[PDB]
Amino acid sequence: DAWEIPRESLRLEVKLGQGCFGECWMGTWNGTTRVAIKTLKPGTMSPEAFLQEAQVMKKLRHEKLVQLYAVVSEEPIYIVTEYMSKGSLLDFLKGEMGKYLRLPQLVDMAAQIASGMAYVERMNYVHRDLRAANILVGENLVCKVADFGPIKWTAPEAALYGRFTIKSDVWSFGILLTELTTKGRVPYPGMVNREVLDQVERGYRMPCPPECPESLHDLMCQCWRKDPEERPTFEYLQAFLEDYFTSTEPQYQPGENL
Numbered sequence: 194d195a196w197e198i199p200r201e202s203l204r205l206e207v208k209l210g211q212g213c214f215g216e217c218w219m220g221t222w223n224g225t226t227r228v229a230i231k232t233l234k235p236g237t238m239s240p241e242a243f244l245q246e247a248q249v250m251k252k253l254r255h256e257k258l259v260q261l262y263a264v265v266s267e268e269p270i271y272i273v274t275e276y277m278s279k280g281s282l283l284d285f286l287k288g289e290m291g292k293y294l295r296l297p298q299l300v301d302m303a304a305q306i307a308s309g310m311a312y313v314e315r316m317n318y319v320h321r322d323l324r325a326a327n328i329l330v331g332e333n334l335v336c337k338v339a340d341f342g343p344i345k346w347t348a349p350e351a352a353l354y355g356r357f358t359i360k361s362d363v364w365s366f367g368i369l370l371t372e373l374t375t376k377g378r379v380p381y382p383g384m385v386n387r388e389v390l391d392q393v394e395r396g397y398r399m400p401c402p403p404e405c406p407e408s409l410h411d412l413m414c415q416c417w418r419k420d421p422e423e424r425p426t427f428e429y430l431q432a433f434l435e436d437y438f439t440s441t442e443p444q445y446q447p448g449e450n451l
């Protein structure tokens with residue numbers, strides 16, 4: 194295992210995250226290079242359980258998935274990755290940084306996540322938890338996919354029958370598109386989880402968010418088709434979002450919030 198590294202090489206400066214699973218920090222690796230590090234509390238999560246997501250980050254490599262750098266596979270376990278300067282995509286949209294984002298940047302972000310997911314698609318994996326809080330933003334508004342181990346984001350066939358496919362990811366990607374256009378507000382405003390399952394199942398889909406182009410709401414609606422197989426591919430979505438402003442919405446004018 195060439196991914197393995199020694200311990201004195203990690204300085205853990207700033208503390209970013211925590212919970213049941215363990216902490217995650219900003220650090221340094223061999224004195225110079227800036228990294229992000231994620232830790233394990235041995236009590237709650239088991240040793241072979243926490244490893245799970247790191248075996249998965251070894252077998253994947255793409256400019257839009259957060260990159261593995263090194264691992265310390267002896268307790269307490271450490272996982273080392275590139276440092277995404279600008280935090281979770283959800284915080285970014287909610288906070289004072291995201292009030293000035295308009296459609297052109299928001300669509301470019303969507304296209305980058307779509308790229309990363311089209312790579313997941315090609316490699317026959319399934320994400321399961323694709324949403325704005327597990328997208329990390331970097332310098333120059335680079336967005337990358339982050340979690341490798343919630344009914345408002347999960348497709349119904351998945352939430353009800355455990356059927357998690359790349360098509361169930363496409364559903365979630367559609368909800369992610371509403372997070373990008375409402376500055377990271379919670380999808381299904383006012384509805385609690387049990388009420389969302391009922392409504393969705395009976396055909397309800399979110400309306401076109403204010404100032405969102407109808408062509409982009411149509412796309413969300415393709416991603417939310419009752420039938421998994423009539424939802425588009427990430428290859429299709431990528432290509433669509435990449436060319437948005439020539440091929441679909443060349444008329445685009447900026448507005449007050451998009």
Ligand SMILES: *[C@@H](c1c(-c2ccc(Cl)cc2)c2c(N)ncnc2n1CCOC)[C@H](C#N)C(=O)NC(C)C
Pocket residue numbers: 209210211212214215217218229230231259272273274275276277278280281327329339
């Ligand atoms: C904390 C975290 C990470 C991160 C993600 C994945 C891995 Cl394997 C290691 C660390 C971040 C990175 N890479 N860059 C910048 N910020 C990062 N954070 C976000 C800080 O959240 C406040 C990680 C995430 N996301 C986390 O908190 N996860 C546990 C399971 C709660």
